[PDB]
Design a protein around this nucleic acid. Structure first.
Ligand SMILES: O=c1ccn([C@@H]2O[C@H](COP(=O)(O)OP(=O)(O)O)[C@@H](O)[C@H]2O)c(=O)[nH]1
Ligand SMILES: O=c1ccn([C@@H]2O[C@H](COP(=O)(O)OP(=O)(O)O)[C@@H](O)[C@H]2O)c(=O)[nH]1
Ligand SMILES: [Cl-]
Lengths: 393, 392
DNA sequence: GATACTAGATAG
DNA sequence: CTATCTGAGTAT
C-alpha cells in the first residue's frame, strides 16, 4: 500500500494522559511510515495536564461549540479519521451537538477508526456521543475482550455486528532509550520513584505502605510523581500518612535524603520525568487493574520505566493477568527483570531490590532483559503495524 | 431546671436520618430553653445523607481513632452527656476501642443519658460498644417497653436498670410558620411519599396505589427518599415502572399526568417540606411491626402535618400507636389524617377525592392534622417530659 | 423458595 | 471526601 492522510481526532480534548500519549505515538508512527498526519483536538474543555507532553507545535485546537465549519473541514480531509476520545458529559449542548453533527457529515469514503481507551463502565458512562461514534465507525479497538466495552455497552447498542479488534498502546521504546538511557555508574540506587496519579487503582497507597515499612527504614528515598491535588488526600491526610508536596516549580526543593517521608510531585513533564527516572534506581508503577480489563495492554508509564534504564517494579497481579505479545504467555512467567511487587510478600520484593542495589553488574543484566522484554511486548514497531494492517485490511 | 452544658454525641457519625434529626431537634429545644449545647459526632464513618439536614455550621466532627484527646476534651466539657448512637460494626479497632476508653474516662460527675433509637435485634446488634454505654448510662430511653432492647438485650446484659420510654419530638410549630402555604397554591393532583428504601417504609404499597388509582385518575406521584441501595435491586427485578431523578435534575421531573411514579433519592429536608407544603397529599406508610410501636412517630410523619399538606399514614400503625394525652389508640380521633388501608385502597382514594375537591374542606382537615400532631409529639411537650426524667 | 429487611469501585 | 453507578446478601 501507499501513503495516506490520517486525521487523529481527540474530541474529548487534550487530557495529557494515556489518550494524549497514544495519539502522539500514533502520530509519530504514521509519520515515520510515510503518512501525512494532522492532529485535531476539541479545545472546548480544558485540562490540567495540558503541557505534560510536547505537542503545541502541531496539535490543532478546534472549538466544536463554534468552529463547527473549521472542524468539519479538518475531519473530512483525510483517508482515515482516527477518533480516540469523545466529548465529556460536562460540555455544553453546542459542543456535543456539533460533535454529533460532524459524525453525520463525514465523507462516506473516509474510513472512521474508533479506539475505545477506558476500561470500567464508570468511565465509559461519562462519554457523550460514543454511540454515534461507534455506529459510524468502520473499525473498533478496545483493551480487553472481556472489558465493560465489549461486554456491557457493545451488546447494549447492538442486541446480538460489528467486530471489536484488540490493541495495545504502543510507544517508540527504542527512541526513549536512545534519548534517556544512562550508565549504571550514574544511578542513585537509593531513589525509589513511583509515577501515576491520585487514583486509588494506580496504587499510591501501597507505595506509601512499602515506604514506611521497608524503604524508609533502610535509608532509601521515595519520590511519588503525578499525584494531582484532589479530595482523595482528605483520606490520605487524616488516614494517618506523612508526605511532602511539591509544585512542579519546587522540584528542586525535594528532600532526596534518608529518613524522609514520601516526597510528592503533583504533575510532570514526560521528558523531565524520564530524565529524573533514568537516574533512578527503581521505578514503581503499581496499577492493580481488574482482570476483566487486562489482556495485552500495559500502560504508558509501564513502558517508560523499562524504557529509560531503571528496574521496573510492577504489580504482581497485573503481570499475572497480562499475556505476552508473542507466545501469549503470562508476563510474570518470564525472566524479564521486572521486579514483581508482591503486595503480600513485600519483604520478598524488598530483598530483590537490595540484591541489585549492591551488584551493579546484575543490575544492568536485569534492566537489559527488562528493556528487551517490554520492547518485544509493546513497542511501536510491532503494535502499530499490527493495527494498521487491521484498519487497511 | 436552670442552665447546663449539653453534649449530644453521635458516635456512629452523622447518618442524616431520624437519629440525626432527633439530635438537631433536641439541640434546638435545649438552646431554646437556655442551655449551652455542642453537637459532637464521630467522623470515623461517613454516610450518604450527610446533607439532608443543615448542621455543617455548628456540628463538631471527631476522629475517634486518631483524635481521642480531642474527643475526651469534648464529652467531659458538659453537665449532661447525651449519646444517641454508637460506632458501627464496620469500623476499625482504633475506633470502637477509643470510643470505649472514652466511656471509661468520662468524669463520674457527668450525667450520661442514652437514647436507643433502634427496633429490631439486627439493628440492636449492628452496633458496637452499646453494652459498655448502656452500662455507663445514668438514664436510658427507647421507643417501646416491648422491644428487643428491653426484652432481648437488656435481659441479656441484666438477668437494674430502668428504661424509660420516649418519642422523637419535633418543633411542629416552627415548621408550620415557614412552609404552610395557602390552599391556593396546593396543587391537589400531586402525591408525594416520604421515607427510604426499606420494605417497612411502605414503598411497595405506594407503587401499587399509583397504579390502581393515582395513575388512572390522571394524578401524578413522586416518591422522595428512595436510595439506590441494594434494596433497590428488588424494585428493578420486580420490574416496576419508575423514573429516577437526582437533585441536580429535580426540575426535569415529568410532573404531567399519566406517568410512572417519579422517584427522587436522597433529598434535602428543607426542599422536601417545601414542595410538600405546595403539594396535594403527603404519604407515609411506615408499616412498622407493633412491638416496636408505642408512642413514637417518625419525623417524616410529623413533617407532613407540619407543612400543611394532607397526611396519609399507614392505617395498621395508628392503631398500635397510643396518643400522648389519654394514651388511647391514635386512629380513634378526628386526626384529620387518612388512614391508608392497603386492603381498601379505593376507600382511601375516596376520602382523597372527597377532600381534594372542596378546596375549603381540605384547608379545614389539615388544620386538624397540625393540632392533633402538635398535641402528640411537639418539642415543648416531649423534651420537657424528657428533661424532667433526666433531671429527676 | 416466600417474606422482610439490608457497599465496593471509581471518577473528579 | 462527594457524586454517579450498579445490581444481592442476610435471616428465619
Ligand atoms: O502528570 C503527569 C501524568 C502523566 N504523564 C504521562 O502521561 C502518560 C499516561 O499514560 P498511562 O496510560 O500510564 O496513564 P493514565 O493515562 O492511565 O493516567 C505517561 O506517559 C505519563 O508519563 C505526564 O507526563 N504527567
Ligand atoms: O433523604 C432523606 C431522608 C430523610 N430525611 C429526613 O430525615 C428524617 C427521617 O426521620 P424518620 O424517623 O421518619 O426516618 P428514619 O429515622 O427511620 O430514617 C425526616 O425528618 C426526613 O424528612 C431527609 O431529610 N432526607
Ligand atoms: Cl491508554
Amino acid at each position: 500500500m501507499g501513503s495516506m492522510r490520517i486525521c487523529i481526532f481527540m474530541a474529548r480534548g487534550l487530557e495529557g494522559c494515556g489518550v494524549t500519549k497514544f495519539s502522539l505515538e500514533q502520530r509519530d508512527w504514521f509519520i515515520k511510515n510515510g503518512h501525512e498526519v494532522t492532529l485535531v483536538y476539541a479545545k472546548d474543555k480544558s485540562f490540567t495536564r495540558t503541557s505534560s507532553h510536547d505537542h503545541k507545535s502541531f496539535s490543532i485546537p478546534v472549538i466544536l461549540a463554534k468552529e463547527y465549519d473549521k472542524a468539519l473541514k479538518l475531519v473530512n480531509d483525510c483517508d482515515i479519521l482516527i477518533i480516540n476520545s469523545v466529548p465529556a458529559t460536562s460540555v455544553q449542548e453546542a459542543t456535543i451537538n456539533n460533535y454529533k453533527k460532524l459524525l453525520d457529515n463525514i465523507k462516506p469514503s473516509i474510513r472512521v477508526v474508533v479506539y475505545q481507551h477506558d476500561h470500567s463502565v464508570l468511565s465509559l458512562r461519562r462519554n457523550l456521543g460514543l454511540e454515534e461514534t461507534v455506529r459510524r465507525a468502520d473499525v473498533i479497538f478496545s483493551h480487553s475482550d472481556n472489558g465493560d466495552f465489549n461486554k456491557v455497552l457493545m451488546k447494549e447498542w447492538y442486541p446480538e455486528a460489528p467486530t471489536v479488534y484488540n490493541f495495545q498502546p504502543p510507544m517508540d521504546i527504542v527512541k526513549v532509550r536512545s534519548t534517556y538511557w544512562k550508565d549504571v555508574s550514574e544511578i542513585n540506587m537509593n531513589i525509589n520513584r513511583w509515577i501515576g496519579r491520585t487514583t486509588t487503582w494506580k496504587g499510591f497507597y501501597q507505595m506509601f505502605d512499602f515506604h514506611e515499612k521497608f524503604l524508609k527504614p533502610a535509608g532509601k528515598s521515595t519520590v511519588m510523581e503525578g499525584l494531582e491535588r484532589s479530595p482523595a488526600f482528605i483520606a490520605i491526610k487524616e488516614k494517618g500518612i506523612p508526605y511532602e508536596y511539591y509544585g512542579n516549580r519546587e522540584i528542586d526543593k525535594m528532600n532526596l535524603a534518608p529518613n524522609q517521608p514520601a516526597q510528592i510531585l503533583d504533575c510532570y513533564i514526560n521528558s523531565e520525568m524520564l530524565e529524573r527516572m533514568s537516574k533512578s534506581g527503581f521505578g514503581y508503577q503499581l496499577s492493580k487493574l481488574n482482570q476483566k480489563y487486562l489482556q495485552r495492554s500495559l500502560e504508558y508509564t509501564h513502558l517508560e520505566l523499562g524504557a529509560c534504564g531503571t528496574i521496573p517494579v510492577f504489580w504482581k497481579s497485573t503481570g499475572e493477568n497480562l499475556k505476552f505479545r508473542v507466545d501469549n504467555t503470562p508476563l510474570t512467567s518470564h525472566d524479564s527483570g521486572i521486579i514483581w511487587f508482591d503486595e503480600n510478600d513485600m519483604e520478598s520484593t524488598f530483598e530483590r531490590i537490595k540484591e541489585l542495589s549492591s551488584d551493579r553488574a546484575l543490575y544492568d543484566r536485569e534492566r537489559e532483559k527488562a528493556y528487551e522484554f517490554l520492547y518485544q511486548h509493546q513497542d511501536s514497531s510491532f503494535c502499530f503495524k499490527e493495527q494498521f494492517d487491521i484498519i487497511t485490511k
